[PDB]
């Protein structure tokens, strides 16, 4: 998987993922599915951002956690928005709401439910992507325009194909579920 992740992702994403894993004391070379999942999720958060104008989103994922909470606090103090109980992925300055982004090798809808239950933050908007071209979002409100989303779905389908082609896909799919 390291050969693969290093070929398919921007080195800064790879570097952020490595930094996140050692920091949680996991080794990218043992936990290779986790490494790939981290990369994939970060990539999506960046592509999601690149869907709005430059004023639109605050990317909270991929940042030191402690600092990231301070940013969520400053947003919540400045705007009046309720404080989420779980750290989100983005803030949307147009809609004035936090967003949780999910990326799943399972079905979009069961993964939504599990995410909704897990994050215990009723006001966070949830947007789930699969590697099969599917998506689900809170109230079928998908936030971005259609082209921005197709770029994400396409990228995820592409990743899945490049994994499958290296015989990496089955292991990556089944590892989520084992988790
Ligand atoms: O699983 C996600 O969509 C995700 O946003 C998770 C996170 O934000 C945490 C860090 C993280 C852990 C795993 C992955 Cl694949 C991506 C990010 C774990 C749950 N907590 C917050 C840090
Ligand atoms: Mn996150
Ligand atoms: Mn997420």
Domains of the chain, CATH where assigned: 1-179 (3.40.91.90)
Q: State whether the beta carbon of 61 lies less than 6 angstroms from ligand 1.
A: yes
Site to probe by mutation for ligand 1, drawn from 39, 87, 121 as the one with most ligand atoms within 8 Å of Cβ, is 87
Question: CA 53 to CA 14: how far, in whole Å?
Answer: 25
Give the method of determination. Answer: X-ray
If you take atom 17 of ligand 1, which residue's CA is the nearest one?
38
| Resolution for this experimental structure (Å) | 1.9
- HEC assignment per residue over 77-110: HHHCCCCCCCCCCEEECCCCEEEEEEEECCCHHH
Site to probe by mutation for ligand 1, drawn from 16, 38, 41 as the one with most ligand atoms within 8 Å of Cβ, is 41
Strands 97-104 and 125-130: parallel
Q: Measured between alpha carbons, how far is residue 79 from residues 24, 65, 91, 161 in Å?
A: 32, 21, 11, 42
């Amino acid at each position: 998987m390291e050969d693969f992740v290093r070929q398919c992702f921007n080195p800064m994403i790879v570097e952020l993922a490595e930094k996140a894993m050692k920091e949680y004391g996991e080794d990218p070379k043992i936990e290779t599915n986790k490494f790939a999942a981290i990369c994939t999720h970060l990539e999506v958060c960046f592509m999601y951002s690149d869907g709005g104008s430059k004023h639109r989103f605050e990317i909270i994922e991929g940042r030191d956690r402690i600092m990231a909470w301070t940013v969520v606090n400053s947003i919540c103090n400045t705007t009046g928005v309720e404080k989420p109980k779980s750290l989100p992925d983005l803030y949307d300055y147009k809609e004035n709401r936090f967003i949780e982004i999910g990326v799943t090798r399972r079905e979009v809808h069961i993964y939504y439910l599990e995410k909704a239950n897990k994050i215990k933050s009723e006001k966070t908007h949830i947007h789930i992507f699969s590697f099969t071209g599917e998506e689900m979002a809170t109230k079928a409100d998908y936030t971005l325009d259609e082209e921005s989303r197709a770029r994400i779905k396409t990228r995820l389908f592409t990743i899945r194909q490049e994994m499958a082609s290296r015989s990496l896909w089955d292991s990556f799919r089944q590892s989520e579920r084992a988790a």
